[PDB]
Amino acid sequence: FRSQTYNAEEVEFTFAVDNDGKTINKIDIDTEAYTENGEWAIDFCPGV
Amino acid sequence: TLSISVLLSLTVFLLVIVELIPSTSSAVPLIGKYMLFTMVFVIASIIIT
Amino acid sequence: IVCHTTATSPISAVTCPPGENLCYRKMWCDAFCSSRGKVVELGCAATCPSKKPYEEVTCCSTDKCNPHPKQRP
Ligand SMILES: *[C@@H]1O[C@H](CO)[C@@H](O[C@@H]2O[C@H](CO)[C@@H](O[C@@H]3O[C@H](CO[C@H]4O[C@H](CO[C@H]5O[C@H](CO)[C@@H](O)[C@H](O)[C@@H]5O)[C@@H](O)[C@H](O[C@H]5O[C@H](CO)[C@@H](O)[C@H](O)[C@@H]5O)[C@@H]4O)[C@@H](O)[C@H](O[C@H]4O[C@H](CO)[C@@H](O)[C@H](O)[C@@H]4O)[C@@H]3O)[C@H](O)[C@H]2NC(C)=O)[C@H](O)[C@H]1NC(C)=O
């Protein structure tokens, strides 16, 4: 993901902060409502 | 000749079957279980022959 | 016993039906935990309700021991 228009000195990205005060540097999943794919399972999903 | 040609026909029909049955990997389909049963039955019959 | 319940809108304190006494609060996260926090479920049961691997369940017998996280007992 990136901004199509603005450079690093115009728009700057940061990760959202969880309600517990921890940075969510990963793809979030609704573990109670997500359903695994019929062919692939997800192990890790870090963000940088 | 009989057993191996039956096996060949079953393989061709498996090539047919793959067009019809779902390619899901979550669990073995009942039709897939029956197909595997038939294939193993043919193979065992060939061994015994 | 009297426990808070989420069956009614808004949450209200309702006396347990006969046969059940324990208050409980179950909370687990969903896709909207980004800003809204964990889901909240309130009710009464005859025994400490079952817990899913991702769901935290709390059980208490005291009065008003299951309020909403943003409200005091
Ligand atoms: C195929 O899959 C689908 C899903 O994929 C599945 O769908 C489920 O089907 C089952 C039954 O088949 C459903 O279970 C029923 O759900 C009813 C709905 O309950 C919800 O809504 C209630 C809102 O109405 C009241 O509340 C509002 C404000 O709260 C008020 O304004 C209204 O006037 C009204 O009073 C609400 O009460 C209820 O809350 C309960 O549950 C939540 C948990 O989410 C909990 O926090 C609360 O404390 C409370 O317990 C909920 O939000 C429900 O009414 C119905 O109740 C039956 O069982 C209860 C016992 O639990 C009895 O008391 C009652 O008399 C009824 O017999 C029951 O629970 C389920 O909700 C569906 N879920 C989904 C996601 O669709 C299909 O079943 C599947 N198909 C097959 C064939 O299995």
Q: Domain ranges in chain C?
A: 1-73
| Cα–Cα separations (whole angstroms), residue C1 to C17, C38, C42 | 9, 26, 14
Compare all CA atoms of chain A with the CA of C37 and give the residue at the minimum distance.
Answer: A19
Classify C1-73 by CATH class. Answer: mainly beta
Length of chain A measured in residues: 48
Atom of ligand 1 nearest to the CA of C6: 48
Which chains neighbour C (Cβ–Cβ under 8 Å, 3 or more pairs)?
A: A
Three-state DSSP state, A35: coil
Does residue C48's CB lie within 6 angstroms of at least one atom of ligand 1?
no
Residue B41 in tokens: 């039955």
Buried b / exposed e over C12-44, threshold 16 CB at 10 Å, is: eeeebeeeeebbbbbebbbeebeeebbebbbbb
Which chains neighbour A (Cβ–Cβ under 8 Å, 3 or more pairs)?
A: B, C
Helix or strand holding residue C24 (H, E): strand C22-28
Buried b / exposed e over A12-40, threshold 16 CB at 10 Å, is: eeeeeeeeeeeeeeeebeeebeeeeeeee
